[PDB]
Amino acid sequence: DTNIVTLTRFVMEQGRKARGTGEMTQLLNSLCTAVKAISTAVRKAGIAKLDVLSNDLVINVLKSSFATCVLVTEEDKNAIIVEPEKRGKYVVCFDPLDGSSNIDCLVSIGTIFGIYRKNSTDEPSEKDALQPGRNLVAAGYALYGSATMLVLAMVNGVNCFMLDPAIGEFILVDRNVKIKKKGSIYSINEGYAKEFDPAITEYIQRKKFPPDNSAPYGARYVGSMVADVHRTLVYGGIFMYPANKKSPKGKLRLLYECNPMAYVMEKAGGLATTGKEAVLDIVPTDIHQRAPIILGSPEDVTELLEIYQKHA
Amino acid sequence: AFDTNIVTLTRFVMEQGRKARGTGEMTQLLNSLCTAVKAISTAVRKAGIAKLDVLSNDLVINVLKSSFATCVLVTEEDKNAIIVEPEKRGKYVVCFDPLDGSSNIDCLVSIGTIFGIYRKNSTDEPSEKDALQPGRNLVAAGYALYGSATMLVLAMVNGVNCFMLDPAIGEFILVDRNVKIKKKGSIYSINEGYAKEFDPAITEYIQRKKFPPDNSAPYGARYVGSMVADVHRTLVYGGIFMYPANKKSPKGKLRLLYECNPMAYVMEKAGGLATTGKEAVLDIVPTDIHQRAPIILGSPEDVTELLEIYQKHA
Amino acid sequence: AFDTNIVTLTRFVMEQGRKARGTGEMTQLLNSLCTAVKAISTAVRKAGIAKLDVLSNDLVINVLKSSFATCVLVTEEDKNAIIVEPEKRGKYVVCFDPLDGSSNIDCLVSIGTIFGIYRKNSTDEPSEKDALQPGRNLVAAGYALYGSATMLVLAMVNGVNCFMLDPAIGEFILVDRNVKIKKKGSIYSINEGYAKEFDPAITEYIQRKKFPPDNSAPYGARYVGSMVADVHRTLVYGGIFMYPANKKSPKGKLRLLYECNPMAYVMEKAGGLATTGKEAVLDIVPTDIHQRAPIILGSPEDVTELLEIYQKHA
Amino acid sequence: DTNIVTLTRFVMEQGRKARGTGEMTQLLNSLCTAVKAISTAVRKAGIAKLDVLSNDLVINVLKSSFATCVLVTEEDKNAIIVEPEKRGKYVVCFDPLDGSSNIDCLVSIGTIFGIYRKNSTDEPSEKDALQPGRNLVAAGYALYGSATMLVLAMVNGVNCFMLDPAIGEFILVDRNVKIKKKGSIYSINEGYAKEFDPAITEYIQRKKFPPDNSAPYGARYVGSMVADVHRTLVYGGIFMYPANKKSPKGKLRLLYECNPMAYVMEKAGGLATTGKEAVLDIVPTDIHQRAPIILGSPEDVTELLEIYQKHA
Numbered sequence A, D: 001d002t003n004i005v006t007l008t009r010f011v012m013e014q015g016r017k018a019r020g021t022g023e024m025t026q027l028l029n030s031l032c033t034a035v036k037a038i039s040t041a042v043r044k045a046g047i048a049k050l051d052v053l054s055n056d057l058v059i060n061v062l063k064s065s066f067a068t069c070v071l072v073t074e075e076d077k078n079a080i081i082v083e084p085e086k087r088g089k090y091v092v093c094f095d096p097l098d099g100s101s102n103i104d105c106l107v108s109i110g111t112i113f114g115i116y117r118k119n120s121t122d123e124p125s126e127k128d129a130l131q132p133g134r135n136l137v138a139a140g141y142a143l144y145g146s147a148t149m150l151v152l153a154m155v156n157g158v159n160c161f162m163l164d165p166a167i168g169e170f171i172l173v174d175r176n177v178k179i180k181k182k183g184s185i186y187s188i189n190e191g192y193a194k195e196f197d198p199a200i201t202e203y204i205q206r207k208k209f210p211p212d213n214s215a216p217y218g219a220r221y222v223g224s225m226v227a228d229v230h231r232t233l234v235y236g237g238i239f240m241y242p243a244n245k246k247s248p249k250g251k252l253r254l255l256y257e258c259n260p261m262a263y264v265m266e267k268a269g270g271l272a273t274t275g276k277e278a279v280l281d282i283v284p285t286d287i288h289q290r291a292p293i294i295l296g297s298p299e300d301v302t303e304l305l306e307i308y309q310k311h312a
Numbered sequence B, C: 001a002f003d004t005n006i007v008t009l010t011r012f013v014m015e016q017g018r019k020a021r022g023t024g025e026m027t028q029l030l031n032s033l034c035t036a037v038k039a040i041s042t043a044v045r046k047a048g049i050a051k052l053d054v055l056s057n058d059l060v061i062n063v064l065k066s067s068f069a070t071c072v073l074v075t076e077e078d079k080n081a082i083i084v085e086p087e088k089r090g091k092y093v094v095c096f097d098p099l100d101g102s103s104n105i106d107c108l109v110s111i112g113t114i115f116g117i118y119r120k121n122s123t124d125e126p127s128e129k130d131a132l133q134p135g136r137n138l139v140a141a142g143y144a145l146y147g148s149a150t151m152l153v154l155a156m157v158n159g160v161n162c163f164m165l166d167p168a169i170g171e172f173i174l175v176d177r178n179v180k181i182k183k184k185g186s187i188y189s190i191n192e193g194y195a196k197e198f199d200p201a202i203t204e205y206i207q208r209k210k211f212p213p214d215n216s217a218p219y220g221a222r223y224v225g226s227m228v229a230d231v232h233r234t235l236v237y238g239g240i241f242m243y244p245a246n247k248k249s250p251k252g253k254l255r256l257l258y259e260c261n262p263m264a265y266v267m268e269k270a271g272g273l274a275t276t277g278k279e280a281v282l283d284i285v286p287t288d289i290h291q292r293a294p295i296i297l298g299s300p301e302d303v304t305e306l307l308e309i310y311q312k313h314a
């Protein structure tokens, strides 16, 4: 198409409106190079751990972006502080590859990330990464399923670019995405049934055998947080990954898994809570700390939040 | 990098057709199915930048025909089994769904193409009665998956083999020979929104994996919600995939002829049983080419840990 | 966009093998050559980011063998014609150069793979004597080009057909049926660095195109310098491509068996003659599989406007 | 490769050293999107004028780059002046597709361009494009042969990036390219033999039947200026397209065909003259004016330049 709106075209155009440095545009532009290379790595990752190529890949793109200064990964003990010659004003927490164990089973997988801005005056440091998800300037994720897709949520909206493999470009296909109010799907790991706290288990019931002589909800669970969240954003519904006996803190890590999705969700008009508080309003203490996550089409999640303090 | 000895499926299945002397009619058929499958994947990967299932149905038909190896074809999408015109005739019956889960593209959940093939057990001029052979007379069944990769999984007599699509040379390349599923797993895959309508044999089984009575792990719940994805997580990692009957689809939802049976053949050829519940899915006499049938599958100790309870409730 | 009726060469040549009843042995052979060719192109396109001709030679061999349709193979790159091991035997002789102009990759000038095939005219157990058949007994010749596109051009009995590689589905798709070259052109293609050493028949011809005696246009000089590119500009746009003999390669440079002959068959099947100068290139008795021979080709009025002067100087 | 040096990485890094606006980097980054899309268009341009997609493509990328203000094409009567909301400090003359007629014959083809900087204070205008090629800040071309290649010549050197089709990125493969002093190839349209002026025709001879009992030169001519120049840059040699009877001004247009190649050549250590003067030292009067072009491995071209004024 002759006037293909790319991601990079798109970003750059909303960055001119901030009267900025062009770094978001460098960052995201670099970010995309790690996403294509990984997407390719997976489409033949089987013809002849991936996590480590993917992690080394994202660090290196981000360093050379000349736009970051602290990078937090799933895969590294401490934060990464960027060399001065290459430093910039942004902080990116990222999970290079979420549900990696599931590549084997040809499960839709993803990269998740979230970009904060270093506001303070001193030596960049992990503390700079201890900011509540509410403060994110930009978020989103890249999905590696039947097509490689990158949903990017910034201060004006959620938008979905789809990688056109014929040209190596992310092309904008869905604009100013908004989630349905209520939907017909719930998503949760039902094998943890024994371990679920009362509010959840009631709500599960409330949906399975609805007391309204209406249709029951449908259930889905791909077991790859990205696929289930993207399904939620688009078809509408709910996804849950609650604090239980196995993991009293939720399994999903905050800064890189929960807060991006939370941000994407709320900007889309969804909600995302822990059942006791909003995910984004949570102040991180550890950069690797976890959280309970219920996110989805507002009315459903609210149904649960009532059920949470109707059992309180 | 650059490997001079690439085992393309066209090479591979020739090492199955030729040493057993049958013309390899099988091969120009499958080769063509490769084109149908390739083409469906590329378009599905740019799907959101350009119904699909119709065109992929029509794709499959056209290529199948020209393999010069067919006589009857049954689609999920077409009523009367397409009897091939005489000029291009051959001996096989291909029962196929072109695009299983064609709804779920827009949510980027993996989807696929299933196929089952028979060889004509008749002297005549063809009819869909040729098509109405039970699973136990399947010469070969397979499916293709459009997930993070394009994987064809092909089951023929010796066993099952999984192939992956190298996009750069356009060839299915072999990545697993003589595949065998596990014995016991730790997954049960079923849509529990239909909780109410489940026959109580299943309803106990769910509780026995959720709340193990003998205090083991609770099984892990999974359900991508596309038959093709679910069989695959089950074939490789093991697990029990259960799509029993409920009342809303009271004789089940999955159409025997090209869904439950191709799966089932692939599945049983790897060490797991595919049963409706009462009988094994491969021996039901195929009545309507769109005849539906329930199906439960995977690694045997789970198919059976349930089977005996299905026998303990009638 | 998305076309359900793609004429893949595997489909197309089946509409030539099957209606003339011959087993289509031709087809699993060619299908395999497609893989060899595909694979060479992808690696040539990332060539500068990863000798090649060796590996492409070895590629071609391996795939050819497994087509289960060969018995002898001759490479530019291998001395003794590779007689195939018995288990995978079939009836064809494939004379091929895997990577014509393999030097010129680094300058990004187009290059290719030429192939010529024979069918064994003997009862025996094979030998390269089977290979030593003249061009006039070629069952089919073709070449593949790695230029701005990957074009296979296939000449078999009915005529020549040009196919292009759709990279997205990995299939050669037909873009020109029953091809015919022009009658007269306005191009002469020859390396005039060798000016001194040219036999004076050619030396007059050059002046007759450069300085037309009858005051027409001067012909347009072209010379990519890779045999494959030069035949193609000649096959479609017409022209005369002349690689005569000089002293430095006094019996010519181009090896009959897989260069001048495959070209020649393709070429003559489209309406142009391929002559050494004295005799047509297709009838010389093939002595050494690496026997060299001169060659001049293209649209006939030019091959002939020179031929008579070659007859006017001996 | 985990630390893939891209074109964009490369450009951006040499732009930080200018302490600049980041526009070269936007320009070139956009430019590359027109190059991939065209490269794809050609690799299946036959499965079912191209010039017009290609031209509309390059204009539109360049407008949206937010880095240009005047764009001169092979294919458009007047120059293109960029809308103010989108204007920037650069001028690009380009030929979107050179030797288009030869796509048919699967001839290696290319895009050629050259980037000048608008130095004056007033309304951008064609005059801004009437600057001698000597002033170019950046030049290069993109070749569409067995692989898509982009040679970029800037103030520090000539370098060749090769498009990695698996990721949609131009990867740097040849650095600080320098041409061989003398080589064994000449390139010229020999069918114009009748029409060539004396200096040329002597030199042709001088090479064909060398009076030194040495080997004669080899001759090549693909008939697609890009392929022959790239061959010259790499294998070394000479290429000529002289003023004759048919075209007393040379066929090749200056601003978009001759000056880019000239620039690339001289930076590479080659020369490029008209036989009477250097191509780059020529002041354009028309934006669509032509020039005689002899370019290649210095000693050879000098051999001809002697022969030019040894017949004067």
Ligand SMILES: O=P(O)(O)OC[C@H]1O[C@H](COP(=O)(O)O)[C@@H](O)[C@@H]1O
Pocket (backbone or CB within 6 Å): A074, A095, A097, A098, A099, A100, A101, A189, A223, A224, A225, A226, A251, B220
């Ligand atoms: O770092 P990762 O390998 O991606 O692991 C995170 C994964 O861990 C979770 C596992 O969920 P469950 O325990 O319910 O299977 C997934 O939702 C999620 O993708």
Ligand SMILES: O=P(O)(O)OC[C@H]1O[C@H](COP(=O)(O)O)[C@@H](O)[C@@H]1O
Pocket (backbone or CB within 6 Å): A218, B076, B097, B099, B100, B101, B102, B103, B191, B225, B226, B227, B228, B230, B253
């Ligand atoms: O939609 P189809 O391709 O016709 O196939 C039916 C699909 O229906 C099942 C899921 O449907 P639900 O769970 O809503 O019954 C999948 O396993 C299966 O692919």
Ligand SMILES: O=P(O)(O)OC[C@H]1O[C@H](COP(=O)(O)O)[C@@H](O)[C@@H]1O
Pocket (backbone or CB within 6 Å): C076, C097, C099, C100, C101, C102, C103, C191, C225, C226, C227, C228, C230, C253, D218
């Ligand atoms: O180099 P090869 O692939 O062995 O082929 C020989 C090549 O040699 C010819 C050009 O060589 P020159 O003009 O230098 O003789 C080409 O037409 C031809 O492809």
Ligand SMILES: O=P(O)(O)OC[C@H]1O[C@H](COP(=O)(O)O)[C@@H](O)[C@@H]1O
Pocket (backbone or CB within 6 Å): C220, D074, D095, D097, D098, D099, D100, D101, D189, D223, D224, D225, D226, D251
């Ligand atoms: O605008 P274009 O279609 O690319 O035309 C320019 C072309 O015009 C020249 C033709 O050269 P010649 O007349 O010697 O064949 C080529 O060198 C060059 O590529």
Ligand SMILES: [Mn+2]
Pocket (backbone or CB within 6 Å): A074, A095, A097, A098, A099, A257
């Ligand atoms: Mn993770």
Ligand SMILES: [Mn+2]
Pocket (backbone or CB within 6 Å): B076, B097, B099, B100, B101, B259
């Ligand atoms: Mn279906």
Ligand SMILES: [Mn+2]
Pocket (backbone or CB within 6 Å): C076, C097, C099, C100, C101, C259
């Ligand atoms: Mn050769």
Ligand SMILES: [Mn+2]
Pocket (backbone or CB within 6 Å): D074, D095, D097, D098, D099, D257
């Ligand atoms: Mn041009």
